[PDB]
Amino acid sequence: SQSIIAYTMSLGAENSVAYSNNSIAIPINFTISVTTEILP
Amino acid sequence: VSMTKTSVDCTMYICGDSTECSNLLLQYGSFCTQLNRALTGIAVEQDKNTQEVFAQVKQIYKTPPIKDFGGFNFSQILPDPSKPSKRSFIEDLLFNKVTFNGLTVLPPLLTDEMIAQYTSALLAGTITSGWTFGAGAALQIPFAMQMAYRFNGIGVTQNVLYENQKLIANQFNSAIGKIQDSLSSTASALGKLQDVVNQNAQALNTLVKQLSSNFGAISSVLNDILARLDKVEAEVQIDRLITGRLQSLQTYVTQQLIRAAEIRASANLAATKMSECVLGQSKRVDFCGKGYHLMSFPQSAPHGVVFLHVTY
Amino acid sequence: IANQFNSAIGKIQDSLSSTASALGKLQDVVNQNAQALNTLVKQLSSNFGAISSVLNDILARLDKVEAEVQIDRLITGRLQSLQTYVTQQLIRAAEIRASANLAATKMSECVLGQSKRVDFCGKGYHLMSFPQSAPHGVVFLHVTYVPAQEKNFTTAPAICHDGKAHFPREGVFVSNGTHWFVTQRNFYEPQIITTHNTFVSGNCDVVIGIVNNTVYDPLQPELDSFKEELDKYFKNHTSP
Amino acid sequence: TTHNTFVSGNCDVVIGIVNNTVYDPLQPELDSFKEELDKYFKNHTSP
Ligand SMILES: *[C@@H]1O[C@H](CO)[C@@H](O[C@@H]2O[C@H](CO)[C@@H](O[C@H]3O[C@H](CO)[C@@H](O)[C@H](O)[C@@H]3O)[C@H](O)[C@H]2NC(C)=O)[C@H](O)[C@H]1NC(C)=O
Ligand SMILES: *[C@@H]1O[C@H](CO)[C@@H](O[C@@H]2O[C@H](CO)[C@@H](O[C@H]3O[C@H](CO)[C@@H](O)[C@H](O)[C@@H]3O)[C@H](O)[C@H]2NC(C)=O)[C@H](O)[C@H]1NC(C)=O
Ligand SMILES: *[C@@H]1O[C@H](CO)[C@@H](O[C@@H]2O[C@H](CO)[C@@H](O[C@H]3O[C@H](CO)[C@@H](O)[C@H](O)[C@@H]3O)[C@H](O)[C@H]2NC(C)=O)[C@H](O)[C@H]1NC(C)=O
Ligand SMILES: *[C@@H]1O[C@H](CO[C@@H]2O[C@@H](C)[C@@H](O)[C@@H](O)[C@@H]2O)[C@@H](O[C@@H]2O[C@H](CO)[C@@H](O)[C@H](O)[C@H]2NC(C)=O)[C@H](O)[C@H]1NC(C)=O
Ligand SMILES: *[C@@H]1O[C@H](CO)[C@@H](O[C@@H]2O[C@H](CO)[C@@H](O)[C@H](O)[C@H]2NC(C)=O)[C@H](O)[C@H]1NC(C)=O
Ligand SMILES: *[C@@H]1O[C@H](CO)[C@@H](O[C@@H]2O[C@H](CO)[C@@H](O)[C@H](O)[C@H]2NC(C)=O)[C@H](O)[C@H]1NC(C)=O
Ligand SMILES: *[C@@H]1O[C@H](CO)[C@@H](O)[C@H](O)[C@H]1NC(C)=O
Ligand SMILES: *[C@@H]1O[C@H](CO)[C@@H](O)[C@H](O)[C@H]1NC(C)=O
Ligand SMILES: *[C@@H]1O[C@H](CO)[C@@H](O)[C@H](O)[C@H]1NC(C)=O
Numbered sequence: 143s144q145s146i147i148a149y150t151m152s153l154g155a156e157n158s159v160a161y162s163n164n165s166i167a168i169p170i171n172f173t174i175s176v177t178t179e180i181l182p
Numbered sequence: 183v184s185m186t187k188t189s190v191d192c193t194m195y196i197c198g199d200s201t202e203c204s205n206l207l208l209q210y211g212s213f214c215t216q217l218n219r220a221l222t223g224i225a226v227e228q229d230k231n232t233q234e235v236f237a238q239v240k241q242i243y244k245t246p247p248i249k250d251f252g253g254f255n256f257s258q259i260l261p262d263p264s265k266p267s268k269r270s271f272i273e274d275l276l277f278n279k280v281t282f283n284g285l286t287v288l289p290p291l292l293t294d295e296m297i298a299q300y301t302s303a304l305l306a307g308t309i310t311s312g313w314t315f316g317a318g319a320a321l322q323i324p325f326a327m328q329m330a331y332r333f334n335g336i337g338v339t340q341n342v343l344y345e346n347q348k349l350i351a352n353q354f355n356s357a358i359g360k361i362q363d364s365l366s367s368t369a370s371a372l373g374k375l376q377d378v379v380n381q382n383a384q385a386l387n388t389l390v391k392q393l394s395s396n397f398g399a400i401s402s403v404l405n406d407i408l409a410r411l412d413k414v415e416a417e418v419q420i421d422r423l424i425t426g427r428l429q430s431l432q433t434y435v436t437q438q439l440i441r442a443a444e445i446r447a448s449a450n451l452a453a454t455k456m457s458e459c460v461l462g463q464s465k466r467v468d469f470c471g472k473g474y475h476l477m478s479f480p481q482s483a484p485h486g487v488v489f490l491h492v493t494y
Numbered sequence: 495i496a497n498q499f500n501s502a503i504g505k506i507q508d509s510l511s512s513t514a515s516a517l518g519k520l521q522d523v524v525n526q527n528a529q530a531l532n533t534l535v536k537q538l539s540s541n542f543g544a545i546s547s548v549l550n551d552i553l554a555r556l557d558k559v560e561a562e563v564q565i566d567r568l569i570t571g572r573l574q575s576l577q578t579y580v581t582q583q584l585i586r587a588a589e590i591r592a593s594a595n596l597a598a599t600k601m602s603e604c605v606l607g608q609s610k611r612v613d614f615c616g617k618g619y620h621l622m623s624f625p626q627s628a629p630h631g632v633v634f635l636h637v638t639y640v641p642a643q644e645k646n647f648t649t650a651p652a653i654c655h656d657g658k659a660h661f662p663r664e665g666v667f668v669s670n671g672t673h674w675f676v677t678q679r680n681f682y683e684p685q686i687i688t689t690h691n692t693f694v695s696g697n698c699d700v701v702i703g704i705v706n707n708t709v710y711d712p713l714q715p716e717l718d719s720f721k722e723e724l725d726k727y728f729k730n731h732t733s734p
Numbered sequence: 735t736t737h738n739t740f741v742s743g744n745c746d747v748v749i750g751i752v753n754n755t756v757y758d759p760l761q762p763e764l765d766s767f768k769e770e771l772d773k774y775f776k777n778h779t780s781p
């Protein structure tokens with residue numbers, strides 16, 4: 143059943159932000175993360 | 183941010199529709215592989231340049247249906263829902279403002295609807311969630327509290343915003359009014375983008391004029407030399423045209439490789455301004471516009487990006 | 495914070511040891527230089543429209559007044575092949591230079607310091623970075639603070655108390671839905687809205703969206719407790 | 735005021751220092767305490 147498909151690329155997940163004139167979101171917690179970056 | 187992808191088939195350019203010239207050209211070896219490869223290297227790095235500038239978010243944030251941004255009128259720079267392409271009124275103005283032989287133009291991977299959509303995601307994130315959508319998940323904040331954090335960021339205490347909010351919003355609305363008028367008024371405003379279209383057009387026009395050169399052969403037209411002469415008298419005449427047309431491509435590909443390195447350098451600057459002026463607030467003096475930086479809004483243009491830097 | 499960091503370093507270690515493509519930006523530079531050197535040596539097999547590509551086999555067949563004309567072809571085509579290689583090397587070397595000046599700037603601003611520049615030392619807010627050497631390259635291990643699981647809150651630009659307006663000294667005013675607090679922006683740690691957490695400026699009529707709540711004074715009880723004791727002392731001094 | 739400023743050293747070191755008062759906001763607060771404490775002593779004489 144595997145075959146080559148061709149499609150218009152999506153740009154990512156759509157995500158309507160919950161904006162309001164008196165609402166804020168604040169993180170109750172945090173993740174420390176390590177990202178590698180590689181340069182010639 | 184980019185320039186038009188061009189592929190020039192060096193066999194079809196040097197030796198258009200001729201077997202005898204192709205069989206001579208093989209005797210020069212791998213140069214035609216180098217020419218095709220170099221222009222493919224350029225053609226791929228133009229999608230890369232566009233991707234590093236605009237794809238700085240992996241999530242397509244969208245405006246709220248209510249527009250209660252504390253009096254700041256962003257309707258000139260959000261998408262217009264009514265147009266067949268979802269671009270802003272300033273992006274549509276910027277799109278009006280820019281104007282046989284193996285030559286092919288290849289389309290950019292990201293169409294102008296998709297560059298407008300990445301620009302919309304960056305801008306809708308910037309209005310609704312401050313810099314936070316650059317650090318991680320987008321966290322909402324009321325726009326006047328975002329401008330307050332900004333004011334504290336330039337070292338002006340945030341009560342200076344709330345006491346003056348009608349004025350600060352009327353000045354932002356008026357300044358976007360001047361951006362609208364400036365771009366409608368003067369021919370030269372987009373010169374830095376039009377200059378790139380013009381150099382590519384001029385360098386290709388120069389490469390085509392070289393097909394009308396003789397290089398000391400009896401004709402500039404390859405078919406005439408093959409029509410008028412026998413095989414052995416023809417070798418010497420075609421080989422001049424091969425030498426001169428090959429050197430014309432070696433020139434053009436070198437000019438394009440140098441020019442692509444300059445557009446790359448401009449794209450990496452634009453990616454740095456997208457990260458440090460749109461996804462943040464910059465302490466860097468003069469980097470995010472003249473003044474003390476509050477915030478910036480990206481707008482697309484043909485092969486480019488426009489930043490609207492907002493400064494105190 | 496340690497257990498998160500020690501896990502994130504473990505994920506780097508595994509990832510580099512598991513997948514092929516992570517070294518791509520360095521392996522690409524090795525492959526382009528190999529491909530260009532290989533291409534330069536292959537051009538020596540090319541005739542350039544001369545009778546042969548072997549210099550001694552030209553000289554072993556033609557006499558000198560025309561063996562020179564074949565050798566001049568090979569000289570022209572091989573000199574054109576070096577010039578193509580050296581032009582490719584110069585243009586590449588300018589790319590690698592740009593990448594070395596960026597890497598030097600990342601060493602200076604992410605390793606020798608902490609950067610407030612967004613994205614310049616990875617996604618998140620930059621804490622620090624650790625350099626690691628690689629063949630012809632540098633790897634940076636950027637360590638960043640990323641805001642995790644969030645909660646929504648009601649908020650206000652200012653608080654109204656004695657008809658004066660109050661603003662946070664650091665952070666933001668938030669309500670849990672019933673009570674008001676002040677918190678640092680980048681981590682939820684609510685505190686009582688005090689005269690020490692806030693500063694006054696002007697009156698409540700000028701600010702759009704200001705809310706009424708009490709502001710606590712921490713010194714008021716340290717004089718009112720002292721007052722109730724003073725009144726008790728006066729009460730005792732009625733007794734003699 | 736003592737909330738707008740911080741203290742270091744003395745008047746002899748800083749080139750171009752100038753005299754002005756600094757308003758300590760605890761002082762008039764406890765002066766509102768002083769005259770109330772004082773009146774309560776005056777009244778407390780009467781019994
Ligand atoms: C919003 O945050 C408030 C502060 O955390 C919270 O109020 C506090 O609620 C706790 C119980 O969950 C109360 O605890 C005390 O209650 C009485 C006091 O006499 C005692 O019986 C208990 O043993 C205990 O000591 C706190 O007194 C109360 N604090 C205040 C300032 O009222 C609210 O409940 C939160 N609101 C929401 C919607 O979650
Ligand atoms: C925030 O708290 C304030 C203090 O409790 C409160 O102020 C009070 O507001 C009412 C309604 O505007 C006023 O009522 C008087 O208004 C006029 C006279 O000016 C008359 O028509 C009315 O009959 C009535 O006398 C109060 O005088 C006023 N009190 C003070 C001390 O200012 C605010 O309304 C509160 N606001 C919110 C949003 O909670
Ligand atoms: C800033 O305020 C200072 C404090 O008031 C003031 O210093 C005072 O200056 C006078 C005049 O020089 C001194 O007067 C005395 O000087 C000597 C003793 O030192 C005597 O011979 C004099 O007869 C007289 O009593 C004060 O002693 C001195 N105060 C102190 C504490 O040293 C500065 O002059 C002021 N400066 C400016 C520019 O405003
Ligand atoms: C924080 O709130 C947003 C939306 O606002 C809330 O909407 C109600 C659910 C209620 O809580 C109101 O008082 C708030 O105004 C949340 O967004 C919703 O997310 C769910 C999935 O979790 C989704 O089904 C809804 O469609 C979203 N609604 C809107 C209007 O966007 C958000 O998830 C909340 N975040 C947290 C961590 O609580
Ligand atoms: C903050 O996030 C961490 C995870 O990154 C939470 O730690 C986990 O807590 C649960 C119990 O609640 C344990 O089962 C996990 O083993 C813990 N993991 C680690 C790495 O310790 C932490 O509890 C969260 N705290 C808050 C207040 O949200
Ligand atoms: C935001 O600014 C725009 C541009 O000035 C306003 O749009 C104009 O509004 C008037 C009155 O409704 C119309 O007659 C014009 O035709 C509109 N022009 C355009 C280009 O659309 C808009 O009304 C403002 N919105 C808010 C909420 O202030
Ligand atoms: C927020 O919007 C609502 C209407 O949806 C309005 O009643 C309210 O007064 C607004 N508050 C602020 C702070 O703008
Ligand atoms: C009351 O005052 C007397 C001195 O006048 C003192 O001995 C006594 O300890 C005081 N008691 C209290 C409760 O203040
Ligand atoms: C500043 O300069 C002037 C001379 O131009 C001098 O008279 C004055 O005393 C100086 N101010 C101070 C505080 O030394």
Ligand SMILES: *[C@@H]1O[C@H](CO)[C@@H](O)[C@H](O)[C@H]1NC(C)=O
Pocket residue numbers: 773774777778
């Ligand atoms: C004096 O003290 C009594 C309580 O002992 C109080 O009722 C009265 O108002 C006070 N009078 C004055 C003049 O302070």
